[PDB]
Amino acid sequence: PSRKAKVKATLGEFDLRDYRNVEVLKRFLSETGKILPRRRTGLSGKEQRILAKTIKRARILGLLPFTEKLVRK
């Protein structure tokens, strides 16, 4: 449904190319370290495409997770 909000509208401006900005970046992953889809990241074909490479960069550097444990169930 994605009736929640858009991760983009839920914060100000930011350098999508900044792979060390853990703060704003982690804001784009799900409960699990998975990269949120546009229906929820509120990004654009192009924007969302860069987030992709940024997040992946931070991941290797050890700043962002490749995966998380689903708490609850």
């Binding site: 490749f66 444990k69 689903l70 708490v71 609850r72 169930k73």
Partner: protein, 119 residues
């Protein structure tokens, strides 16, 4: 025999049988049970009831060691798995938390024919 109080309850669900493994605070197994451990021999170890019985067997056996609360960690997708959870919840043991940790590749080994054809 070595009173552990709190620990970990691991549920390993599957389409073929369930098996719970209680461990101490850092992964080491205190006691375990399964659909086989109990009476069920074949097609019903997977059955949700078997899941219940097994989870409960894990409880008792674990309670004897003087345990009274554990974190549940579910792995796998299988018939009767939430039953194990519900079981442990009623087992007496306090279910501190629950967490699915089923492993998934990021695409490693070619699955057997039985599991191929996915998209």
């Amino acid at each position: 025999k070595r009173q552990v109080a709190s620990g970990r309850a691991y549920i390993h669900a599957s389409y073929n049988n369930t098996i719970v493994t209680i461990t101490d605070p850092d992964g080491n197994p205190i006691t375990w049970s399964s659909g086989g451990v109990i009476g069920y021999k074949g097609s019903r170890k997977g059955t949700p009831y078997a899941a219940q019985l097994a989870a409960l067997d894990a409880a008792k056996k674990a309670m004897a060691y003087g345990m009274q609360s554990v974190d549940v960690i579910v792995r796998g997708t299988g018939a009767g798995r939430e039953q194990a959870i519900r079981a442990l919840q009623a087992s007496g043991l306090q279910v501190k938390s629950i967490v699915d940790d089923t492993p998934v590749p990021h695409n490693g080994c070619r699955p057997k024919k039985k599991f191929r054809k996915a998209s």
